Assembly symmetry: C4
Homo-oligomer: 301 residues x 4
């Protein structure tokens, strides 16, 4: 950064197709010691993810991150997921009984595979301290830290010991940080990603702003390992929240229209993303990383 | 490419008018051994073209390309069109009984004047192979190959032996490749054309993105020999698809409003295009190629 | 040209106000041997101007140009206007009985004060010929020629003997030349004016694209002597066309909402334009010519 | 200026958060001899402010400026506010019985703490004269002068003796100066502020264009001491004007929807602005001044 742009400004340029069917394209990705079907993860929000969803995903090799909204239920969540041969992926804060939470986890001999320290303005000593604290008590837990919007936050989190950082400050559909405060990556998420990624030693989770499945490929182009999606996963039948009636579900953070089975959404993502690999002139996800691109004048639209 | 822009960004600059009536302007063009009334061709899609339309066009020296959706009907289509003193212009794929199709055509002593190898991502060995195959079995067939979106695809198709290439990856009104995959010329079709054309030895068919008849002239400015149009030819009385009721027709690929006779559309195209030649300070189509232009800031609109 | 922009891109920068009331600002302008209240003129179209309006304007020192749509009525129009102590301002073409029209005028000893040769694509020998013809038969007639969109057309018309040129190719609200042909100053009228004006020895009439009264001042900034307005003068009670019923009038060239008395419109123009002179740090119209300006990013709006 | 942009083009870049709660951020500011809760002030317009509001604000250490619309009521307004242990902040003009108004104030031994000379086009000798006049008769009155839109107006007002200048020419929601005259900072207010501020020795009040509370922080970034807000303060229950019925209030200068208590609005401003300080990596308002920023391509939206 550089020129500033966002998802809709970007068109990726096709290379020579080397496959006969998109079916020969592999969209898996790896994050620490584990391998997942898709580079996407639903937002770790109560309006998007619950234990039911978490189990479905885990049982099918989809990465998931559980929200933190009922912090008391986490211990037994971990234990359920882990007795099940499944990954336990949870979120923590830094305020303040969760310092003894991760200490209780150590005593309980309970190591979650993934822990995400998820704070609105995650560029802080508060976040550094919780990272160090977890590397100390649960050194075998893969730690995702954020949210951040700069290369400088990314470095300083990675230097605190984060295994991955989460990038995005206010680009969410239901997020209003840009309006209230005038700060963040809203309006330039994809470019804020190019630029954080340039400086990252650890996987980045691009968080927020995704409006189409093509934006997964674009996020891949510009440095993401994983893409967090709230809006596009909102309003499925499996989704949290009640349904009204045609047909609608609420979606909010800490009014949409009904979308069908989350599995159809996920297979469609995978298919679109395999088309993306065809277009990127390759067989796997990483082929996307090398393609040229143009910044269009009006949009995509 | 260069600056990226699209049809609506472009205004062409008028030269001194050398005609008294647009009627003295000639909009014909030539593609291989044949001469046509207009540099336009309806999309080779089942929602746009059928044998009825194909016959009308052919009988009136309008270039047409037939879709491939009932591949069994092609043989007798060719034979009908050819017993009629008319051009037989068909589409083929590369999967897989159509390798013996063009071999059956050779045995049948049936040479179609035009064959279009029409694949979404036509930059592939698959397409190269079908080109070579046809140059081998039906060497007297003019071969149009695509679709492509780069100078590199254009060269490599032309080097495989294509007589013309079709340029456009996702700029169609009903096309969703840009949304699903994040790849292609959608949002910058006209510039993707300037740039493919710069590197082409063979006629290019600019395929997709045309929203006004002025965009035909613009496509001419930027290197097209021929312009393929789906949307603007959708929904005529002669058009495929049923009519509802006011008055509508469906338009889709592999919900519009009713447009009148296709002949009125075509005479209007010709007239607008003769106005375009008046403005280009000339008497024929090629006068458009030399005019200056500006990229406006907001649009045309 | 230079950077391309249009009316809405432009903000003019205020200089020190040297007046106590906008009332001390003089918005008059001169075109040949005559002095007018405002640098504006209604479009010389049948949907905008008739003899009733023409008389009102003339009787109040507003410049007007009469349309050509009933060419038989012109002779007696001139004579009426001229027996009245009023300016006779008419439009002519070049096809073809109007070569003897201006010859009939010579015989009739009838010299119109202003004659406008008004052709869509006025950059032509056709227009040059009619200019020379009029300078020959009615040498005392002020000749306005056009329409043009380039410095080159402006020079060549001025060299043919035009006393003023009319600039604008398709920026009209009801004009569709940009859509049909892909040619003209639509989308960049104000910049097409900066640029024609840079090369002009004669007054330019900026014709078309005016959407607000501020655009009169902007046209002044960028070189106009006079501004032709169709849309903003459409739909007044005095205006041509019938009224329906709330309340509407048609507006078209060769569906709006009702606007009130044309005199209120004209006094308001004058007042806004005197505000413009206050802001331009002056007392007269020409003060506008010297102000700085910025090209904004989104619009004015 | 420089690149031209406005509030929606701008995203501010977060620095390392050094607070645990936005509650530890101080949003106070000082203007002359007085200290206020927020860098915001409601527009000194009759549709926004009255004595009731003025008293509320003053009694709670919110800066306010009273409009001038009932000039006869000012004397006793000052006296009421001043007998109350409250700041008396009034507006004056330059026409013409207000030269003896400020002379009557001197005789009455009535010194208003703040006086704002509030003229549409305030770059004038008229404004200079009233400034000098007040510095002469009421030298202990803090004088705010404007409105202006250039560094040159700012200097010349500050050189006349202004204690602060008010910046903004036509960016108001209900302002139509941009449409009528084609002049001012509408469409580029925030950049017109960067640029006036660069040349200012005195506090600037950024006046107009604020659409979100984030735009307060942005105005801070670009040089404002104080931000005047009309639109966002329109339509509260305490607000001037009648209510209709759901629920609406009028808002106009010299049709909205009902907004709630002005105190909720003001506490929310303060809270958003403390979030802004968290994001700016600081504890006080001035931390905002140092942050980086990007100009996005489409908007914020
Ligand atoms: N600042 C803020 N961000 C939120 C909130 N709720 C969700 N988000 C952000 O946006 C979500 C995903 O964004 P989306 O895919 O809908 O654009 C989450 O991953 C999170 O980063 C909220 O209440 N406040
Ligand atoms: N990728 C894709 N392209 C299509 C489809 N249907 C039509 N098209 C493209 O768009 C058509 C013409 O575009 P239009 O004139 O409507 O913008 C065809 O010529 C073809 O290139 C489809 O189903 N998928
Ligand atoms: N090409 C074309 N231009 C027209 C037509 N009718 C009006 N105009 C142009 O536009 C008018 C004024 O434009 P407006 O103020 O509405 O933007 C006339 O002065 C003329 O230049 C038409 O039918 N065709
Ligand atoms: N020129 C002009 N400006 C006005 C008028 N009424 C309000 N304003 C301006 O706009 C107000 C605030 O703008 P807002 O916050 O609504 O964008 C006032 O502070 C003032 O500068 C008016 O009638 N004419």
């Amino acid at each position: 950064m550089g020129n500033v742009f966002d998802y809709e400004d970007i068109q990726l340029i096709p290379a020579k197709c080397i496959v006969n069917s998109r079916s020969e394209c592999d969209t898996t990705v790896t994050l620490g010691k584990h391998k997942f079907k898709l580079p996407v993860v639903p937002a770790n929000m109560q309006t998007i993810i619950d234990e039911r969803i978490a189990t479905y995903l885990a049982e099918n090799n989809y990465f998931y991150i559980m929200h933190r909204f009922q912090p008391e239920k986490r211990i037994s969540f971990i234990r359920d997921m882990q007795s099940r041969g499944l990954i336990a992926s949870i979120s923590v804060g830094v305020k303040e009984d969760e310092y003894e939470f991760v200490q209780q986890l150590a005593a309980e001999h309970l190591t979650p595979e993934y822990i995400t320290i998820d704070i609105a303005h995650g560029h802080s000593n508060a976040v550094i301290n919780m990272i160090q604290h977890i590397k100390k008590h649960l050194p075998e837990s893969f730690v995702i830290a954020g949210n951040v919007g700069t290369p400088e936050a990314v470095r300083e989190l990675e230097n605190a010991g984060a295994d991955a950082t989460k990038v995005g400050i206010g680009p969410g559909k239901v997020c209003i940080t840009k309006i209230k405060t005038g700060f963040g990556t809203g309006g330039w998420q994809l470019a804020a990603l190019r630029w954080c990624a340039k400086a990252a030693s650890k996987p980045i989770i691009a968080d927020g702003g995704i409006r189409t499945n093509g934006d997964v490929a674009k996020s891949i182009r510009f440095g993401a390992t994983m893409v967090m999606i709230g809006s596009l996963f909102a309003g499925h039948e499996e989704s949290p929240g009640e349904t009204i009636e045609k047909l609608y579900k609420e979606y909010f953070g800490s009014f949409v229209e009904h979308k069908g089975s989350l599995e159809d959404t996920l297979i469609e993502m995978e298919q679109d993303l395999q088309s993306s690999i065809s277009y990127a002139g390759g067989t796997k996800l990483d082929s996307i990383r090398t393609v040229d691109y143009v910044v269009v004048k009006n949009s995509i639209f």
